[PDB]
Amino acid sequence: SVGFSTGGWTAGTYFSDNKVVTNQTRQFLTPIYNGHTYKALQADDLTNENDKSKWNGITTPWGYFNFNCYASHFSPQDWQRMCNEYKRWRPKRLRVQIYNLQLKTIQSNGADTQYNNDLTAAVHILVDGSHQFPWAQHPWDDTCAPELPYVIYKTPQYAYFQNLAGLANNVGTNSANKFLKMNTPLYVLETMSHEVLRTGEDTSFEFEMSSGWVDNQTNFCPPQLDFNPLHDTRRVAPRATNNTTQYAPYPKFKKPSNWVPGPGMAYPGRGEADGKRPAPMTVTLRPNTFIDAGNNTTDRFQQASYQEWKPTDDTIIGQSINVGPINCAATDPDAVTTAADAEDDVANPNTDKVSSHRYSIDMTRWNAIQINVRRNNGTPETTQIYRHYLYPMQAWNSNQIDRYTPIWDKVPNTEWHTMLASSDGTLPMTHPPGTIFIKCSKIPVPSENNADSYLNIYCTGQVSYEIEWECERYNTKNWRPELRVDPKNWTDPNNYNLNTQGGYIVNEELYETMPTKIGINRVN
Amino acid sequence: QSINVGPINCAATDPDAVTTAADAEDDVANPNTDKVSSHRYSIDMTRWNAIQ
């Protein structure tokens, strides 16, 4: 009833050979969002020249839970133990419980604000498990459940994309412009069946997860260098004299390999001080039936070549498609393109404060690739491949991740996709755990004039979430001891600890990395 | 050797009209530009104009 709890606090991590189970409970707060209504959100009004986008979408009264991050499921201790004791792991399933719900009215009496509970108020809880709504979740959003278990979790508001103002507009006849505008979808969560719960009710959800592995081990040997120098190779290298070729054997310590360095792009980005085109890769969209108005009413394109339309810089900035990290097996951009978790004062350099995946010592990831030719006049020349695509006989490893990395990303729903090897370290999965949407019930109050007037309320409760992790211990024949995740290298010995104000101390002087793939060697 | 390969455009949308065309007779007397069939009409957002 009203005086019975619908659950209890569940916490702690279980370790075993084949599986690890994490248990977290958070007290959460859900307010009223967006005035209980749906609104269009147009970035052209919200932005300015420093960062401009034509992004259009819908903001909703709903909010959602986000469990996607490792620091959400692992304490620094438990993350250390994962990295030290297991060669790889992946999430098998997620169980979420929402319970001990409280609905309070916010009512002002004089200057005081009084908080009384409405025992008959309800909460809307929607789970979209088949992903029929947009999936607005960017993996690096700051909306994830809090790291410390005693911190309140404010649920983020849900909003999604509709169209690009430059592409979708009223221009031309039988044009991609109107069709993008006509065909723009609208999603309202009240059109799907969902639960409504009062204080005595609770609910639960389970999600099966299929994905690739997070690999904790590193390759000490470049696959090209794994050979025995004591012996000759039968294979001979060409030597060009005049119009003929003379052959000589490769040296014992240089043996040609069948194995090609993995795909990679070393592009840092423009490095500009604005927010216009910050990513290494930007993309522009021009449907072939698109009509350019020659105004600001549409995107702008000049034809550079026959049947080629080059976007203007404003068009590139406007469509705001930013792609990164794209580096894959190239290691030069690692520090610059993977960075996160930094606030910019500009007063003090955050260069070493920022987190990035730069710390991998793996030997399958390349600085530079050189191709070698000889011209007719006898001049050898070598150039480098800065964008190197998928090619037969490539083998490589993912970059390292840390505890502040998001766990998963959603694979786009499309006909075709290539192998899912992420540069940011997420595990792409076709169906991630379904989003749990939460909304306070809309309690209307009578009004003399016609007006939308409701009762100001909010929801508080406890969310318990649990992931079962499939893991594997390592065996090695290595004689020597290996690197492990440890505090010894920290600049600041007092880290992941509390100060006298209650502040949680993380990475104040420098970013202290607790990365995967630090020490465990696998043989080629 | 007369080896001709097309359409190769795949996800690039600029060649769509020009490289996919078919079902046209050439009199040259009247323009067949709009008479010809091609797959140019997709509004899909996964296919790109340009990559920078």
Q: What is the DSSP string of A366-425?
A: BS--EEEEE-TTS-EEEEE-SEE---TTB---PPP--TTS-SEEEPP-SS-------SS-
Report resolution in angstroms.
2.5
The single-letter DSSP state of residue A114 is E
C-alpha A15/C-alpha A85 separation (Å) is: 10
Q: Which residue, chain included where needed, has tokens 């991630």?
A: A432
d(C-alpha A347, C-alpha A241), whole Å: 61
Q: Determine the distance in angstroms separating the CA of A269 from the nearest CA of chain B, rounded to an integer.
A: 10
Please, what's the b/e burial string for B3-31 (b: 16 or more CB within 10 A of its CB; e: otherwise)? Answer: eeeeeeeeebbbbbbbebbeeeeeeeeee
Structure tokens at B1: 């050797």
Plot region of A336 (φ>0 → left; ψ -120 to 50 → alpha; else → beta):
alpha
**CB neighbour burial string for A270-295, b if at least 16 within 10 angstroms, e if fewer:** eeeeebbbebbbbbbbbbbbbbbeee
Sign of CA dihedral A373, A375, A379, A383: negative
Cβ neighbours of residue A186 under 8 Å, at least 6 residues apart? A58, A162
Give strand pairing partners of A160.
Answer: A58
Taking the CA of residue A421 and the nearest CA in chain B, the distance in Å comes to 19
Report the alpha-carbon distance of residue B8 to residue A245 in Å, rounded.
37
Structural element, H or E, at residue A316? helix A313-319
Cβ pair A309:B50 closer than 8 A: yes
Method: cryo-EM
The DSSP secondary-structure symbol of A212 reads -
A506 touches chain B (CB under 8 A): no
A444, A453 in Cβ contact below 8 A?
A: yes
DSSP state of A190: G
Assess whether the previous peptide bond of B15 is cis (omega < 30° from 0): no
Q: Can you tell me the distance from the alpha carbon of A142 to that of A144, in angstroms, rounded to the nearest whole number?
A: 6
Sign (positive/negative) of CA torsion A75, A210, A137, A272? positive
Q: What is the CB neighbour count within 10 angstroms for residue A24?
A: 23
Helix, strand or coil for residue A522? strand
* Residues sharing a CB contact under 8 Å with residue A357, sequence separation 6 or more, in sequence order: A334, A338, A399, A400, A401, A402, A405, A424, A425, A515
Nearest-angstrom CA–CA distance, A439 and A60: 10
Residues with Cβ within 8 Å of A278's Cβ and at least 6 positions away in sequence, in order, are: A269, A270, A272, A322
Under a CB-based contact definition with an 8 Å cutoff, are residues A26 and A34 in contact?
no
Written as one string, the DSSP assignment of A419-469 is ----SS--EEESS-SPEEEEEE---B---SSS---B--EEEEEEEEEEEEE
Note whether B42 contacts A: Cβ–Cβ < 8 A. Answer: yes
A162 to chain B: closest CA residue = B45
* CA atoms within 13 Å, Cβ hemisphere of A411: 17
Distance, in Å, from the CA atom of A292 to the CA atom of A297, rounded to the nearest integer, reads: 9
Return the amino acid letter for A137: Q
Contacts of A179 in chain B (CB under 8 A): 43
- Please give the residue of chain A at the shortest CA–CA distance from B51: A283
